[PDB]
Homo-oligomer: A and B are copies of this chain.
Amino acid sequence: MLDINAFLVEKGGDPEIIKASQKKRGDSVELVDEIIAEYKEWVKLRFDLDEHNKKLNSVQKEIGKRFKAKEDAKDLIAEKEKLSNEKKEIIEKEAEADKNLRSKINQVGNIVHESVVDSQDEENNELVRTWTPENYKKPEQIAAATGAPAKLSHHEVLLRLDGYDPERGVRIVGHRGYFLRNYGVFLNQALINYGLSFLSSKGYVPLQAPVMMNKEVMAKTAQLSQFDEELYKVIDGEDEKYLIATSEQPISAYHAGEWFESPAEQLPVRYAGYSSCFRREAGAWGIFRVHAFEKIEQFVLTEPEKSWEEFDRMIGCSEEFYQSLGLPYRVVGIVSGELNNAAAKKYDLEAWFPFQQEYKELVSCSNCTDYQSRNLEIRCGIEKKYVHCLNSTLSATERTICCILENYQKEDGLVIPEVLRKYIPGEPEFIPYIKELPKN
């Protein structure tokens, strides 16, 4: 969440910037004034509590003097108990005020960076840049790597290669369940390992996250809307955990409660996160939008003064990555009304799917400034100063496979993207269609 002081003009805050940000988000603006009011009540309680402390101390010292003089203290004792019963109420109320104030500040989204388009309609997404392999004229229904007609959808290509099994997958696990088979397995591992190797050559530290999280730690890194809709709950006898939606959740908590006291030399810290990811929400056919999948994720901690530069570095890496796979794409600046609570700025890389004949999102890159690190108490250098946290998909591997399948197809099978060959037993340059489709 934002700092409490950001709401308070008297403590150097700017409640107006916050109201403007809420408006760009399409979220509640009255929430800011509510918070400011609650803050004053809470301060009143702090003062009253504090004055009660001092009055009790006094009335204690007078009661001691009277017991010294061997004099009755029935009147002082009565006042001591009056003050004390009050201190009790006050204590109970201050705690409830603190509790509600924190819950309210928790609903306020991060400050939307000025560079972001003010809009609730994705039509207005900034078109940041576009990229094409040089042997590919323009985005159309042509598979970019082969020049061949993008005749088959990713689901169709995968099936002809005998690379996956949705039919047996659904019978066994339900909606969108699947097995990967043969080269479907090798392509998936190829991406995981190429992704790890790629990021690691850029100084990222490979980091395999666990895929369950304690409820309480999850709650500090993901918004209220996520649990009761997106996350699988896991039953552990009597305990509950969540399956993670992305390794960004557990990896963001990695340095919770730590302190980069010498930021210049210690930061930035860069992680090449790898894990499976689980989503309750996933709806066509194929492995494009499914309930379980693997993701190589970029996660970075930087000094506050360096995050925007890092943000550019990060999207740069994902671009360099898709270029290396020869996949055309565009980068778009997500409109304010579509940012999640933690993001001050978000870019998506959407790669071209030539059969679908549209750009579809493969990568999402966000500067979350100190919104999560504040919660997680991840401090930075020498009111309190936290690190900034950025996260950017490197590759959601099953979805990246889909894009590959459509762009690497040709009449008789699939060209294997050059960079992935060394990761595949036999380093094949090409694999043939094994199966005919029913349709035709």
Contact = CB atoms under 8 A, between A and B. Distances in A.
A214 B250 contact: no
A181 interface: yes
Contact of A206 (B186, B197, B200, B209): B186
A286 B196 CA distance: 23
Given A193-B193, A234-B232, A182 B210 contact: no
A197 B239 CA distance: 39
A254 B208 contact: no
Contacts of A211: 276, 292
A203 interface: no
Given A213-B173, A241-B173, A253-B172, A208 B188 contact: yes
Given A206-B185, A207-B181, A425 B201 contact: yes
A348 to B, nearest CB: 27
Interface string A179-199: 111101110110011001100
Nearest to A185: B206
B210 A169 contact: yes
Contact of A196 (B205, B233, B239, B425): B425
A179 B280 contact: no
B280 A237 contact: yes
Output the residue of A213, A232, A253 with the most chain B CB within 10 A: A232
Output the residue of A206, A274, A425 with the most chain B CB within 10 A: A206
Nearest to A168: B254
A332 to B, nearest CB: 32
Output the residue of A169, A208, A274 with the most chain B CB within 10 A: A208
A128 interface: no
A45 interface: no
A192 B250 CA distance: 23
A206 B425 CA distance: 11
Contacts of A182: 205-206
A49 interface: no
Nearest to A229: B237
Contacts of A192: 189
Contacts of A232: 234-236
Contacts of A274: 185
A171 interface: yes
A269 interface: no
A256 interface: yes
Output the residue of A171, A177, A179, A241 with the most chain B CB within 10 A: A179
A184 B171 CA distance: 35
A212 interface: yes
Nearest to A233: B235
